[PDB]
Amino acid sequence: GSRIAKRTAINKTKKADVKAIADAWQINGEKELELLQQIAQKPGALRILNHSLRLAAMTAHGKGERVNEDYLRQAFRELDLDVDISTLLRN
């Protein structure tokens, strides 16, 4: 049957919801792999933050993106997380 995972999982938890955004994606290379080493398998909640957390892997964001632990925030924050990171950007 359907292979739906355990929805409602703990994606970046709530307390680590903004701390993961820092050590979660390209923040170091070994400390970020750990977070996802136990987060993309038990998220069930990205979507909400994924709207702009999809950047965690998008290291080419041609519009606004830093290059380091900050990049993450400048990736899923430099924009807004409501429409700029949606599917609407160009003209």
Structure description:
- By secondary structure, this protein is mainly α.
- The protein has a single domain (1-91), classed as B transposition protein, C-terminal domain (DNA Transposition Protein, Chain A, Orthogonal Bundle).
- The protein is 30% helix and 0% strand.
- It has four helices and no strands.
- It has helices spanning 20-23, 31-37, 46-53, 69-76.
- It is globular, with a radius of gyration of 13 Å.
- It starts with 19 loop residues before the first helix and ends in a 15-residue tail after the last helix.
- The PDB classes it as dna binding protein.
- The entry lists the keywords Mu phage, recombination, transposition, ATPase, DNA binding, high salt, solution structure, DNA binding protein.
- It forms a monomeric assembly.
